[PDB]
Each structure stands twice: as structure tokens, then as C-alpha cells.
Design a protein around this ligand. Structure first.
Ligand SMILES: N[C@@H](Cc1ccc2ccccc2c1)C(=O)O
Length: 307
């Protein structure tokens, strides 16, 4: 893959690919991602950090916004607590091999000019649109709060995009990103990552929902987690184990199997893995065993580096 294709790889969308190519032509390029700090850093975060590392390899300076105040607004707790979690998060991303600069939302998001821009952009953003943009982001709430519609206008604040060529996030961010693209002086390139399915398989992988593999989980816990994971034969859609195989595993992948169930297998691409599986020629147990073991290896230097 040339640089663009390495960046494109495993992304759900790039807005736009022709803005991206324009950016690649510059020397100094910078890419931002923001995270509500999470108590556990899981494969969902790792997917995104891997993409930040792609960009880093392509010569981008990486900025990570530790979005404590957004996390406050999105009901994840008190600010001082969210900040400590953010410092943990920082440690985990650095363990992953990302070389980035880290900015804490609270350090600038209470400045008068920032706030004035929250208010300015609240006048330009409808309630309907704001609520729409948060459908995939908002904390579950029977009685949705005003905080919910403040969150996306804050996320579109020009201070976040000053000097940044590209913003990265999951597909759940896309409506907020489209709003920024409409409201800011400068259109920033959006690169969107896919959103991982939970181990249990209903919704998406989340720290607050107990359906995650944390990058620091021990080998034992990773096995037990992937043991109980949802993963039907021939069913590639919403299968977290196949997602793990697609997004984390290096190919060719040598799957282990007893001789009495076809013997050890080699798949030279995720494409090959997918057909073998969708043809009901690779059973869940065998895929599960192979994903658990390759994951442990993948994660080992991160978990050990975290000690
Ligand atoms: N909304 C994100 C956090 C988040 C908050 C503010 C941002 C500002 C600019 C670019 C990305 C940003 C991501 C989350 O769901 O974790």
C-alpha cells in the first residue's frame, strides 16, 4: 500500500479522499482524535490508536484530546476523577507505540473565547440536529439533559481544529464531524473507523457495559472472554471474533487444529478467513482458539509495558 492506502485500510470512511490526498502532499500534517477518557482501554480504542499510528507513519503529528469536559457533560462523573482516568488512558496509548502530543479539554475549554464560540455555534445549530448528532454518543437517559446538546457544539468548537488537517474517530462521531465541516472556517478531513461489536454481540464494545477486551487483560481473561463471546458458524455480520481477526491479526495466520478436525490451517488474508468461515469450513471454536492466542501475542508487549 502507498501512504493513502495504508491510511485508508480498515477505515469505514474518509471525508474526503481527495482532501486527504491534498493533505498528504504537505510536509507538515497533523491529525487529531478525541476520547472521553475511559476507565478501561479496550480493542475499540486500540483500533483507533492503530489508525493514529498509520497516520504517524505517514508523517503526521498526532494530537490526542483527552476530552474530560465532554465526558463530564456526557455523565461519566466528576471532572477531577475524569482527569485521572485521562492520565491512565495517556499511559496506555503510549504503551501502544503512539508518539503523540496530549491535550486535556479542561485546560482550554473554559477559556472565555472558547466559551463565546460555544455560544456563537449554539445559535447556528438546531436542537434537532444537535440531538440527531448524539444518537450514538449520548449516555442512556430517560430524561435527556441540556448537557446532551451542548456536547456536540463543544465538539465542533474551532479551537479543536486549529492547525489540524485530519480528525479521526469512530463512525458514531460522523454526524458531529459533518456539523464541524459545515460550521468551521476550514474543512478538516474526517477519517472514520468502524465501531466494534461487543463480545456478547448485541451493541458496541464499551467500558461501562462489560463486553470488552481491555488491552491489558491477562491471557487468562482474554481466553475466558473470547470463550464466552458471540460467534456463529457462517455468520460474518456482527461477529466480534471475525472483527478481531479483521482488525488486529497479522496474515498469513496459521490456525491450529487437531488432525481429527482437518489439521492446522494457513489463511493468507482476512478475505480467505472470511470465506473459509462463511462456507462453514472453519468452526467458531477453532477461530476462537486462534484469535485468543494471536491477540494475547499482539497485546503482550502493551500489557507488559504497562507492567
Ligand atoms: N466525542 C468523542 C470525544 C471528542 C470530544 C471532542 C472532540 C473535539 C474534536 C475532535 C474530536 C473530539 C472527540 C467521544 O465520543 O469519545
Amino acid at each position: 500500500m502507498d501512504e493513502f492506502e495504508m491510511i485508508k485500510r480498515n477505515t469505514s470512511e474518509i471525508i474526503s479522499e481527495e482532501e486527504l490526498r491534498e493533505v498528504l502532499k504537505k510536509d507538515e500534517k497533523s491529525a487529531l482524535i478525541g476520547f472521553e477518557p475511559s476507565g478501561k482501554i479496550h480493542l475499540g480504542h486500540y483500533l483507533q490508536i492503530k489508525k493514529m499510528i498509520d497516520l504517524q507513519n505517514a508523517g503526521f503529528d498526532i494530537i490526542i484530546l483527552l476530552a474530560d469536559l465532554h465526558a463530564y457533560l456526557n455523565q461519566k462523573g466528576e471532572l477531577d476523577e475524569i482527569r485521572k482516568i485521562g492520565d491512565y488512558n495517556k499511559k496506555v496509548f503510549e504503551a501502544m507505540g503512539l508518539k503523540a502530543k496530549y491535550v486535556y479539554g479542561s485546560s482550554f475549554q473554559l477559556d472565555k473565547d472558547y466559551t463565546l464560540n460555544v455560544y456563537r455555534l449554539a445559535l447556528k445549530t438546531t436542537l434537532k440536529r444537535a440531538r440527531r448528532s448524539m444518537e450514538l454518543i449520548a449516555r442512556e437517559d430517560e430524561n435527556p439533559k441540556v448537557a446532551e446538546v451542548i456536547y456536540p457544539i463543544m465538539q465542533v468548537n474551532p479551537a479543536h481544529y486549529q492547525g489540524v488537517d485530519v480528525v479521526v474517530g469512530g463512525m458514531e462521531q460522523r454526524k458531529i464531524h459533518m456539523l464541524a465541516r459545515e460550521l468551521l472556517p476550514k474543512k478538516v478531513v474526517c477519517i472514520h473507523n468502524p465501531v466494534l461489536t461487543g463480545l456478547d454481540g448485541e451493541g458496541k464494545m464499551s467500558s461501562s457495559k462489560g463486553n470488552f477486551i481491555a488491552v491489558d487483560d491477562s491471557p487468562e481473561e482474554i481466553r475466558a472472554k473470547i470463550k464466552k463471546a458471540y460467534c456463529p458458524a457462517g455468520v460474518v455480520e456482527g461477529n466480534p471474533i471475525m472483527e478481531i481477526a479483521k482488525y488486529f491479526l497479522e496474515y498469513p495466520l496459521t490456525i491450529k487444529r487437531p488432525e481429527k478436525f482437518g489439521g492446522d490451517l494457513t489463511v493468507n488474508s482476512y478475505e480467505e478467513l472470511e470465506s473459509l468461515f462463511k462456507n462453514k469450513e472453519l468452526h467458531p471454536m477453532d477461530l476462537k482458539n486462534a484469535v485468543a492466542e494471536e491477540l494475547i501475542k499482539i497485546l503482550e508487549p502493551i500489557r507488559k509495558r504497562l507492567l
